[PDB]
Design a protein around this ligand. Structure first.
Ligand code: MG
Ligand code: MG
Ligand code: MG
Ligand code: MG
Ligand code: MG
Ligand code: MG
Ligand code: MG
Ligand code: MG
Ligand code: MG
Ligand code: MG
Ligand code: MG
Ligand code: MG
Ligand code: MG
Ligand code: MG
Ligand code: MG
Ligand code: MG
Ligand code: MG
Ligand code: MG
Ligand code: MG
Ligand code: MG
Ligand code: MG
Lengths: 172, 203, 144, 49, 56, 60
RNA sequence: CAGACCUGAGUGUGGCAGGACUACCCGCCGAACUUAAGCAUAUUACUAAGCGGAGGAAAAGAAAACAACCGUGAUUCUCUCAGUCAGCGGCGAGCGAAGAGGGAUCCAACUCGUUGCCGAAUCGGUUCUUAUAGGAACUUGAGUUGUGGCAAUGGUGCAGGAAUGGUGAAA
RNA sequence: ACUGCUUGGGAGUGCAGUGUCAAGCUGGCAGGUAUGUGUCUGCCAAAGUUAAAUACAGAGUAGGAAGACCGAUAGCGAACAAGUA
RNA sequence: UAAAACAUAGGUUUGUGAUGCAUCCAAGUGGUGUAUGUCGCAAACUGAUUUCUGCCCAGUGCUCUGUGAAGAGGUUCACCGGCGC
RNA sequence: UUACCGAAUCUUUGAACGCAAACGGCGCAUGGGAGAAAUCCCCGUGCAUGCCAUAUUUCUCAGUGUCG
């Protein structure tokens, strides 16, 4: 630390390094490419092994959690019992025909619900069962209307302040 | 619902009747070996929760354990190096007493495979946990779908590896989520995972 | 490249630029930031003035996802509007509509001189953005 | 410091009683019923060092 | 006992953990089922052809 | 050995066989659960696997 | 009192345990050097050594999880979150994660106890069927001090394949 | 509660010891600042199994593929009857 | 460095009646003096004998003589719990 | 002869386990062998501890435990 240099915080004061003395804590990726093939061989080794069957089972369209991501629409982890019911599928039958199930999910909103019942209902059309014997909103463009009058900020800020000082306006 | 009666009768350990029964036992158990096999559990309803079944190849053992904290076995009680690492009497074993009783038993009798243990009694000096060892090579065990996992070699000494419910307790695994992230595959696994110096191949 | 190190230049010059006197040692001062409050005091105080101390309220278990409010200025809404779509945008006519969550922005700060109207569609707005955006004949429409 | 000799005698190593040639404990007869309800005559046989 | 279909019950006197049956007399007293304690689980045993019976 | 495998042939005596003649594998292959007892499944599972067999399928 | 049970022995019988390996992995144990320009908390490090245990991986795992969302949904791993306007800290040296997100993996889930309805339907052994069948008869032997069920395969036969090997080119 | 270790975990992250010791007729646990209280949200602990993706940081078995590596004072201690003399 | 030191006998002093004294041990119905028992044991000082060990107890050392209250609770205040002399 | 692998062979030991052990020692029981005027001698197998199961034609028992 002589000079303008930023204060360094290089956390390497543990014996991560491998020397005569230590078996180090190191994770190199030298086998990264080999693994990429291994998986690649193995997924291909698997799809060949189960030819008719889709490489990956049907999954729900779920909402992402926080405000940072609730706009995002990731693939989920198996359908709700209520979704499988509404699609008319049997929930313990569903996995056997390649539909993932998830007992834990709740359909908190009719939106994600109905996006999925359509999804299973769409999947069951495409499905061919050998006998034993992501949608989202978009907008175009429009003339501004009543929007030109109202300031959305004092609208935004009332509604924010309404919550923000809601506890402090009770005591008053 | 006989279990429901026998389970809440034992929830009143402090009741003077249950306090009397327990009294006579702890007396009775003091005059017995540190390990004692039972033809039956003292707590049939509790042993059965933990997977005991009155079947061939299930056997129960009452393993005694001295209570109180560990005294760290340094010579003459002296400790070397830093003052923090001093302290003989007050540092405690970082291991459960159901664990230590499951481990005493499973080490004495490698013939068997402990399934669980439960608290049985505890006088001033001792605690008694009755372990439910399974015998891996009893045919009844080998052939029962509910239990024959224990036969698989992966569980040879589950208890010594802290896999039993007691050994998961002190191992912190009674907590999912943010209360056991530093702990979670294992404290060791958590350590590798955080202390590794990953070198991405192209960085 | 080892070729280029001045290790390789001063092969032959006995002290590798460390000096005949005042020899190149090890840790002539301490490891790392040692003596930040002592013999390197003049150094942190000159360069890293705020380095020592505590300044504010703690926020135990900070969750930055809830806090995520990235901003785009009025002056930068051409980045989102298609240049082709944006071609004719009279304030009294039809306007390009610009969802900002789609484009990864949350608040709308009202910086420079917007002059081409747009119906910006965003979670938050500045006092000056919704005003400017209206005066241009556009309109923010609140979303979440 | 280093272990005091008073403390080392407690190891009782070199510091144990000899007693190879000791005759055994020199005690009274076991408190028999005969002691408690009569007497036992024993003749002294030999006085040893 | 609980269904009170029982019209007499015979708790055994001795039991390995009396806890198994310790509650039972209070439970018959509550359902107002007649009950009796009797000397040995071995006798309820042979009476039922089992080598021991905690109850009958 | 060909005439003691003959003396102890048949299930009834195969447990009584001298263990020099008993099929040595590894200590583990012998102590491991056999498929005969390995593939055992509880009667409920047995039924809930018949009721929902891994029916084959494709997706056009 | 004959036995009966309970408790406990002694043999016979059939088994297992102990050792090795221990890179990785699981449990406990547990330093100091070092760093802090001294040094005790700290750091090294929840490391080394020490003890005990597994397996081909292990451990983990099916929510007493996160979030606070338009909500997600076992575990492990990974990239990132993040050397962090988190946090710990002689708030010093230093230490330092988690949710989310992309992904790998994933036709991944189940079982008891309990509850309720039954109540030996169970198990072990014997014999038996070309079979120590998930079959059958038989057994007081264990088991109602609660096995088990319900709801919340074995025997024999053929083939192909794959895989290993064996063979096999030009000039 | 106390103690002790532990943790980024901060009026407690996990744990252990000891004391104490619930609830399930406004249940219980989590909701990262203690307390009492009221809402709401997720969960349902103290029993069990469980592949794959992961480790092999001084292992083995049987093979294989390599190298901008070393080139006999180098590379493993060991290119050799080397953990040998 | 064979002494003048250590030992030594002799002297004194201290602890101590086994629930003991000294004392080992990580730990125990563990260990040593102790297979002992005050003519013993453990601890110290002095250093044969003869002779004598005066004065000082100031210092130092040794010895001896949970329950209430407030609070919504966390909590807080209060009362009881080996020293000094 | 080479290569491989199924059948075996695998001495003394070693966890080492019948008891020991600077002893190539010594047992008890079981069967064999040679042999010999049986005693000796060689050999095979069993014989450690702990624990679980079992006594399947249900072994023998012990307790001023409980009763009858
Ligand atoms: Mg020069
Ligand atoms: Mg220079
Ligand atoms: Mg120089
Ligand atoms: Mg210099
Ligand atoms: Mg100088
Ligand atoms: Mg800060
Ligand atoms: Mg071992
Ligand atoms: Mg230092
Ligand atoms: Mg180690
Ligand atoms: Mg596992
Ligand atoms: Mg597991
Ligand atoms: Mg998850
Ligand atoms: Mg650390
Ligand atoms: Mg049951
Ligand atoms: Mg620490
Ligand atoms: Mg529960
Ligand atoms: Mg060389
Ligand atoms: Mg002298
Ligand atoms: Mg004198
Ligand atoms: Mg004097
Ligand atoms: Mg031997």
């Amino acid at each position: 630390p002589k000079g303008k240099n930023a204060i360094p915080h290089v956390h390497q004061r543990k014996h991560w390094n491998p020397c005569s003395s230590q078996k180090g804590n190191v994770k190199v990726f030298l086998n990264q490419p080999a693994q990429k093939l291994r998986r690649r061989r193995l997924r291909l080794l698997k799809a060949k092994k189960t030819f008719p069957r889709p490489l990956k089972a049907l999954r729900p369209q779920v909402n992402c959690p926080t405000v940072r991501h609730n706009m995002k629409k990731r693939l989920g982890r198996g359908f709700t019992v209520e979704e499988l019911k509404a699609a008319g599928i049997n929930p313990r039958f569903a996995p056997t025909i390649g539909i993932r199930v998830d007992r834990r999910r709740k359909n908190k909103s009719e939106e994600g619900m109905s996006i999925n019942i359509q999804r299973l209902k769409t999947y069951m059309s495409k499905l061919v069962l050998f006998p034993m014997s992501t949608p989202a909103p978009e907008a175009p463009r429009k003339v501004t209307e009543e929007e030109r009058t109202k300031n959305v900020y004092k609208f935004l800020k009332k509604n924010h302040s309404a919550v923000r000082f809601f506890g402090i306006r009770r005591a008053r | 619902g006989a279990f429901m009666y026998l389970n809440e009768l034992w929830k009143k350990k402090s009741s003077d009747v249950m306090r009397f029964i327990q009294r006579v036992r702890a007396w009775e158990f003091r005059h017995q070996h540190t390990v004692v096999r039972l033809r039956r559990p003292t707590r049939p309803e509790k042993a059965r929760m933990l997977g005991y079944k009155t079947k061939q190849g299930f056997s129960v053992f009452r393993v005694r354990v001295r209570r109180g904290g560990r005294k760290r076995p340094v010579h003459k009680g002296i400790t070397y190096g830093k003052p923090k690492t001093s302290g003989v009497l007050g540092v405690k074993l970082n291991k459960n007493s159901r664990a230590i009783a499951e481990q005493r038993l499973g080490k004495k009798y490698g013939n068997l495979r402990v399934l669980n243990s439960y608290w049985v009694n505890a006088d001033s000096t001792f605690v008694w946990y009755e372990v439910v060892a399974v015998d891996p090579m009893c045919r009844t065990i080998r052939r029962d779908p509910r239990i024959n996992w224990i036969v698989n070699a992966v569980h040879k000494h589950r208890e010594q590896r802290g896999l039993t419910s007691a050994g998961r307790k002190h191992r912190g695994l009674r907590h999912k989520g943010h209360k056991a992230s530093k702990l979670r595959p294992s404290v060791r696994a958590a350590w590798r995972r955080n202390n590794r110096m990953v070198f991405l191949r192209k960085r | 490249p080892t070729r280029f190190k001045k290790t390789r230049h001063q092969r032959g010059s006995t002290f590798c630029g460390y000096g005949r006197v005042g020899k190149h040692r090890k840790h002539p001062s301490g490891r790392g930031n040692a003596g930040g409050q002592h013999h390197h005091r003049i150094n942190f105080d000159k360069y890293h003035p705020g380095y020592f101390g505590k300044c504010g309220m703690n926020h135990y278990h900070l969750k930055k996802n809830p806090l995520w409010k990235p901003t785009i200025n009025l002056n930068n809404l051409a980045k989102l509007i298609a240049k082709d779509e944006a071609l004719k945008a009279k304030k009294g006519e039809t306007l390009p509509v610009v969802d900002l969550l789609a484009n990864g922005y949350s608040k709308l700060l009202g910086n420079g001189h917007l002059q081409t109207p747009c119906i910006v569609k965003a979670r938050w707005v500045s006092k000056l953005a919704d005003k400017k955006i209206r005066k241009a004949g556009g309109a923010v429409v609140l979303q979440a | 410091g280093k272990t005091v000799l008073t403390c080392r005698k407690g190891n009782g190593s070199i510091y144990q009683v000899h007693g190879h040639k000791r005759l055994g404990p020199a005690k009274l007869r076991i408190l028999d019923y005969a002691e408690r309800h009569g007497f036992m005559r024993g003749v002294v046989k030999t006085i040893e060092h | 006992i609980e269904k009170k279909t029982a019209r007499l019950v015979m708790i055994a006197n001795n039991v390995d953990p009396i806890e198994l049956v310790l509650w039972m007399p209070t439970l018959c007293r509550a359902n107002k089922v007649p009950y009796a304690i009797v000397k040995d689980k071995a006798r309820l045993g042979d009476a039922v052809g089992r080598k021991t019976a905690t109850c009958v | 050995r060909e005439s003691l495998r003959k003396v102890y042939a048949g299930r009834r005596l195969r447990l009584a066989m001298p263990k020099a003649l008993r099929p040595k594998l590894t200590r583990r292959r012998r102590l491991a659960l056999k498929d005969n007892e390995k593939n055992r499944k509880t009667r409920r599972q047995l039924r809930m696997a018949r009721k929902f067999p891994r029916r084959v399928y494709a997706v056009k």
